[PDB]
């Protein structure tokens, strides 16, 4: 019953999981080493294509938490989602934490996941 | 069945509740802010229930709660909250101590929650 | 309708929910006091702990969230469940954090929680 | 003979370390559990009374060294040393930074360090 | 004996605390609003500000306490050391910290403090 | 005739390991052990300490002040312990910092660092 | 540790010291200007409240002192101890002294302070 | 957790309470009717007594609080207590009070209470 | 197990008794002969003094009775704790008092007791 | 002679003591175990006996020394004066003093003396 | 016209401050200086003491007998001196007592008292 | 016209003053040091010797003001009366006041003075 997409057996995790209704992305990023607005869209691209995996797009997302090295980066993050998101935003909460990938010059300056749904 | 989103902040780019289906998805939720601890977390449930309240639901509904802490050391002042306020019936949850988008210090912010409610329909 | 098990009145939380299809764990901790791969261990074990309750498996875990004291520890817990989950992975993301407990030596350094799905 | 004051034998350090000109004081707490502007005084306090060990007063310190649990308390600290310095201030920075004490109520939320300079 | 330049009476603090033959910096900041080079540059800007009132220069500085936003930035304020501190370089330690000021698009990055020294 | 003596300079990272200024000495953080246990980590940043100060013929009896960093500050117990072996009842004023650092954490990471001021009366 | 609860800032006393185990209480006054028997009360009531904000009762008082313009009222405090204490009495004495207060119409009668244990 | 022994009913009061390691003591008072001396031997032979329901003895006194009609006759009790107390003495203070209780022929002239501690 | 500081054979008294935690002043008295406020601050210079036989101060004191020939001095004592007491004030009674000794020119005006605590 | 009234063998005093011109009143007290308003009047109650044995009144009285187990009642006593005493007063003071009775419930509050005069 | 002549009446109180009956002159309790020191107070009580006797021209000459009031008894030196320099070799007889007052002590108190009785034939 | 006997020069008093047909006492005491009875007894010996300078008795005292350390001693000065007055009694008050003199063992408790008539 539980369907597993975008496995990642190095990292040992799964990249999107179905079950039921709701679909669990796992933490997305991309553009890595990039500017901060390019690694929001870069992980908001990842989260895309993990959703068209199951035939959604951005409009099923209903919770998401985004990662921030430097948390006073949300208002970036506000600009990208009210240009990606066509008007319909997920319930969501950011946190500021390191992560287990250098910062400073092309670091990694930010991740997001989440939860979405689709009526089966 | 149809996402609903409620409780709309065009501005933060955010919804308040989010149902879907039997599930209902809060949004980080803050009250009483600039005030001490104690009250930052009642204004913080505050919140959650005038959420729930949108759809019907109370804090019984509530299955799961993430809770950020300027000061995770302030738990025990939470957990204090929590057994008044759910009266014997207590979520899952998990505690993270996070700085915030806003200033600390003297009036400063302290506490955020958010979580997952249920209502079969 | 909503089923609690594993219920710790002192700290007002509920170690596993019941909501209709879905199951959701407060952070588990085990082996605490020892050092980092033997937590990890002890947290999954917990987490099993509480699945079998409902007569559930590290099979139905759909999302984890993983809570460090040094997020640079990732490796030791894609080892653990590696060795653990059987070639089913749940999405995640991991964060560092402090804890309203001590570190150094004997002191806490991960916690996991999560959701869980079992259809009916 | 570089002179020692006011040593803990237990922890390891010397309260006050005279050389020369120079006096290198350990890092002062005092009205440990009260709210943070008390935490502030008790800490000027205890440095107080260290510098008094060699007959020496606040005006004799030349930099200071601010540990907060939490940052943006730094008014609070200023519009103490302005009632207790008599317009002769020090160079200082401030840091955020966990102490192996627990926070929250009654909690460790301020320590300070400092150098003093009196020519004999 | 101390003598006390740039005194800040707002903040309560002295820019450059002269004790016999050393001074004693408080953090210096510069160039706020801008990239992590830039404000590592107007940081050392006001460091030599600061210097020149008592006749001195960066080859004076024996020692320097850096704080970082980001501490991974450690490589961008080194390739500025080398550019500007031609040769002779102070001891120095390097710490993440939190600023009583807002981070993200504009925010502070970077402050530094230091001891000089010259002989009389 | 150069009054500020520079000792084990780092062309690489611009930093010096020790400045001698007039009756002080200035402590380039120090490291030592690195990917090995706190307690080995908190020794080697003391075994460099006291390379350090040797260049100038002292000794941890001449350390009148130390900044103690740590990636986990609970860890300050481990250190007193060491502090107590190799000090020998002669002990620094200091204070102790949590702090993440430009290199990995986790397994063989690093986890502590020290620097300090010395003081030989001339 | 010592918590300093009720604290009177103009006259210089702390209402309740908690020390380890005991708490000690200033000396307590109530419905002043009225009879002896409401002075008793009045000063009981006060004790209450109190040990109110430590979570005690009168059950925890071990020792108390009773001071009186008269000491011949003892009688008077000893019907209202039985009346409140039901069953479980301190040890006490009973001191005869003047009060900075005016005696006589409305004067002040009766104070009366203590200990109280509650073992941790 | 707290016991009350030797009670008194009627005056409602208790002669001693045990709370934790320490004793509180009733005033205490004997051999009324007769002169100052004696009465002071029996208000120590009543504090013995009643120490000796938990098996202690004077040694165990660590303070005194003694209520004199007349204070001027604290030398008698000086050399009572040289006496009976064998070297090792308790804190003290006197009082020159009035007593609820005739004085003259045959009147009551002294009292004492105190503190006693026994570590368990 | 108990310890007795400051003892004086003469009077049979110990100037304080140390009891587990607590810590028991024989009254104190100093500056005699002289007005009320210096005997008040004789009284607190030998508290201090008997203190510091157990490396405590006035912070370590919990409870305080204050002994007057004229109880209306207590706005004087009470100025004089303001002053030297640093915020942190004990739970008190005060009584007026004979003494036996002789009031008058140069008589005795004052005297204080109490218990101070410092944990083990 | 001095002459002397109103006896009391039992407490070796005498009430109301003539010598010539001058009237000299042991301790007044009455009204036992009242209030301090009633106690007050109970004691110049008993100063107008001992005067009246003699033909005198309070008119004739000339100084008063009044004992109170509690001083800052002075007032009430006051009061009671300007109520019993029509526009003429003593010469007085007041003292504040334990008494052989009890205080309390009931106990002894006040007692006053006194001098009188009479041609 | 009445035989007791009542001089000095103060209405509020209730009390005479100078009543003669015969060659007998009784005073009201004295006091003078309140707020002052023993001293003070004590030269204070016997100014007014003073003022009443010269309302029928006497002075400290004529007084007889004398009850001194002290907060404090043993200030009775403090009294001592002063009848000493203000009595002129002729002294009364007297006792003193310890008593409240119905006045604050402390800090400008009242301290001390005195009343007493004169005589003065025809 | 007035007369004054036995005047002390020191102390500033006269022991009797005549004055017309009055004889005015001052304060009497004797046997000092010696039980309550005797105390009494001597006072009155000294008003004896007062009153035989001018050739009178104890039939002549029209008043006295009895002083006491202890007012309940009444009934042993009322003893002494009978005995001493027989049938011839003086109008009294009784006062209970401290003295300028020690209490206690051998110290003084009691004092007399009173008025006398004699018609010339």
């Given at each position: 019953t539980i369907?597993?997409?975008?496995?990642?057996?190095?990292?040992?995790?799964?990249?999107?999981?179905?079950?039921?209704?709701?679909?669990?992305?796992?933490?997305?990023?991309?553009?890595?080493?990039?500017?901060?607005?390019?690694?929001?869209?870069?992980?908001?691209?990842?989260?895309?294509?993990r959703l068209a995996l199951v035939g959604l797009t951005l409009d099923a997302v209903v919770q998401m938490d985004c990662l921030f090295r430097d948390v006073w980066n949300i208002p970036v993050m506000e600009k990208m989602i009210k240009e990606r998101f066509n008007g319909r935003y997920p319930a969501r909460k950011s946190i500021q934490t390191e992560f287990a990938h250098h910062g400073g010059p092309q670091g990694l300056l930010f991740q997001v996941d989440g939860v979405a749904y689709s009526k089966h």
């Open positions: 369907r597993r997409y975008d496995v990642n057996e190095d990292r040992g995790h799964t990249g999107l999981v179905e079950a039921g209704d709701f679909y669990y992305l796992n933490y997305c990023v991309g553009n890595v080493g990039q500017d901060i607005e390019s690694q929001i869209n870069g992980a908001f691209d990842e989260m895309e294509r």
